[PDB]
């Protein structure tokens, strides 16, 4: 019966007192008072069942978030839906209420070096857990980093997440890609499907640069432009890095470009901590095989105040999908969604 700028937000007697926060991909996000726990929470209404791709996104997200348990990964506290498949039109995901996300925060606020260091550490701590589960997030960016008032950071939005599959990462030059353009590693445009852990480290490097200047570091206007921004700062790849690209069409594209020198990080980020820029460099390395891994990044000097591998937990087991969600109709995905959300029924 409660409505928020229609639409219906029917989250039962448990959640009342709704208030609009923003608009998600397949519905709206509000805060609400949790009459049981006596705190406000966030609730996301998802109406995905009219598009197969929305259903896939939703299923991934629910399955992974229910399995993961980590302080730097948003948890699902509750899921509200109708008692039967027939009656289920919407799903409501309840989470802890966060204050903001890093996208909204960087629109108006300069981060201190201590804030950048702490947020980086938390991103990487959460990512170490994700990667330890053999999962790739594949859409890390500021808006998918939730923040509370005490600067706790939680990674959210696993709708593009997949199990890592390095053996099957190769693709042709200029293969279409769905994840947010600005945070795409250079190999996506050249020879990669984004099925290795290195794709996520590049995104975190883009996020670090964006925390240092309050502006995206590689704001491509279109697919190939993205590559051209990246190369404009990193400069021409070395011969060894080109030789690592066997895809003739991709290698020849890079060979066709005029020589460009590297733009030094200290020029782009004159106010930055030197150790931050050294870690930035290692995350925004062109060759994905040479790019720093999450655990190495945590051990970097920049993060010395926080690094403690005994307090940077891993997952208890790898994550696997029963079935390939890519192949599955609108209707079967609705069925699995119903099953995945069953534990929250009374
Ligand atoms: N758990 C949460 N707490 C507070 N705000 C949230 C939460 N999840 C998402 N949001 C916000 O709601 C809007 C839609 O976000 P998203 O659906 O995740 O894309 C954005 O303003 C997000 O910052
Ligand atoms: Mg999102």
Residues in CB range of 152: below 8 A, 6 or more apart: 71, 72, 122
Q: Which residues pair with 155 in a beta bridge?
A: 73, 145
Q: How far apart are CA 343 and CA 77, in angstroms?
A: 11
| Nearest alpha-carbon partner for 145 in 223, 213, 204 | 204
Q: How far apart are CA 265 and CA 272, in angstroms?
A: 9
**Solved with:** X-ray
Given the CA of residue 29, which atom of ligand 1 is nearest to it? 12
> Ligand 1 in contact with 75 (CB < 6 A)?
no
Residues 204 and 288 occupy one common structural domain: yes
Task: Determine contact, residues 5/20, Cβ cutoff 8 Å.
Answer: yes
Q: How far apart are CA 309 and CA 190, in angstroms?
A: 35
Backbone angles phi and psi of 8, in degrees to 5: -65, 130
Q: How far apart are CA 217 and CA 200, in angstroms?
A: 16
Residue 70: how many CA atoms within 13 Å on its side-chain side?
A: 28
Residues 52 and 14 occupy one common structural domain: yes
Q: How far apart are CA 208 and CA 272, in angstroms?
A: 11
Residues 107 and 219 occupy one common structural domain: yes
Residues in CB range of 339: below 8 A, 6 or more apart: none
Q: How far apart are CA 13 and CA 225, in angstroms?
A: 50
DSSP state, 324? -
Residues 21 and 166 occupy one common structural domain: no
Given the CA of residue 99, which atom of ligand 1 is nearest to it? 4
Residues 115 and 261 occupy one common structural domain: yes
Measuring from atom 14 of ligand 1, which residue has the nearest CA? 24
Distance (Å) of CA 72 to CA 266, 308, 327: 30, 15, 31
> Ligand 1 in contact with 145 (CB < 6 A)?
no
**β-sheet with 145-147: strand ranges across:** 100-101, 145-147, 153-155
Residues 78 and 11 occupy one common structural domain: yes
Give the distance from CA 66 to its chain's centroid: 16
Give the distance from CA 340 to its chain's centroid: 22
Residues 92 and 135 occupy one common structural domain: no
Going through the chain in order, the beta strands assigned E by DSSP cover 15-23, 28-34, 39-46, 78-80, 91-96, 100-101, 135-136, 145-147, 153-155, 162-163
Q: Provide the CATH number for the domain around residue 24.
A: 3.30.200.20
Q: How many domains does the chain have?
A: 2
Range of the domain at 140: 98-326
Task: Determine contact, residues 59/337, Cβ cutoff 8 Å.
Answer: yes
Residues 66 and 137 occupy one common structural domain: no
Residues 201 and 272 occupy one common structural domain: yes
Q: Provide the CATH number for the domain around residue 199.
A: 1.10.510.10
Distance (Å) of CA 146 to CA 98, 113, 222, 298: 6, 19, 27, 20
> Ligand 1 in contact with 42 (CB < 6 A)?
yes
């Amino acid at each position: 019966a409660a409505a928020a700028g229609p639409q219906v937000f029917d989250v039962g007697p448990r959640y009342t007192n709704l208030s609009y926060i923003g608009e998600g991909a397949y519905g709206m996000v509000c805060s609400a008072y949790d009459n049981l726990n006596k705190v406000r929470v966030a609730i996301k209404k998802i109406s995905p069942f009219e598009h197969q791709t929305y259903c896939q996104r939703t299923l991934r997200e629910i399955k992974i978030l229910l399995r993961f348990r980590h302080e730097n990964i948003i948890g699902i506290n509750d899921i509200i839906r109708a008692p039967t498949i027939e009656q289920m039109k919407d799903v409501y995901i309840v989470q802890d209420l966060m204050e903001t996300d890093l996208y909204k925060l960087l629109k108006t606020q300069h981060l201190s070096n201590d804030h950048i260091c702490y947020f980086l550490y938390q991103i990487l701590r959460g990512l170490k857990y994700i990667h330890s589960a053999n999962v790739l997030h594949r859409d890390l960016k500021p808006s998918n980093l939730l923040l509370n008032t005490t600067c706790d950071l939680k990674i959210c939005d696993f709708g593009l997440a997949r199990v890592a599959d390095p053996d099957h990462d190769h693709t042709g030059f200029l293969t279409e890609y769905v994840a947010t353009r600005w945070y795409r590693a250079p190999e996506i445009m050249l020879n990669s499907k984004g099925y290795t852990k290195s794709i996520d480290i590049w995104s975190v490097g883009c996020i670090l640069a964006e925390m240092l200047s309050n502006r995206p570091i590689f704001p491509g206007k279109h697919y190939l432009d993205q590559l051209n921004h990246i190369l404009g700062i990193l400069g021409s790849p070395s011969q060894e890095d080109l030789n690592c690209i066997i895809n003739l069409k991709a290698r020849n594209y890079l060979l066709s470009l005029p020589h460009k020198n590297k733009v030094p990080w200290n020029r782009l980020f004159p106010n930055a901590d030197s150790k931050a820029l050294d870690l930035l460099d290692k995350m925004l390395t062109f060759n994905p095989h040479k790019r720093i891994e999450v655990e190495q990044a945590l051990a970097h000097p920049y993060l010395e105040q926080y690094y403690d591998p005994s307090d940077e937990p891993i997952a208890e087991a790898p994550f696997k999908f029963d079935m390939e969600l890519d192949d599955l109709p609108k209707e079967k995905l609705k069925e699995l969604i119903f099953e995945e959300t069953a534990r929250f029924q009374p």
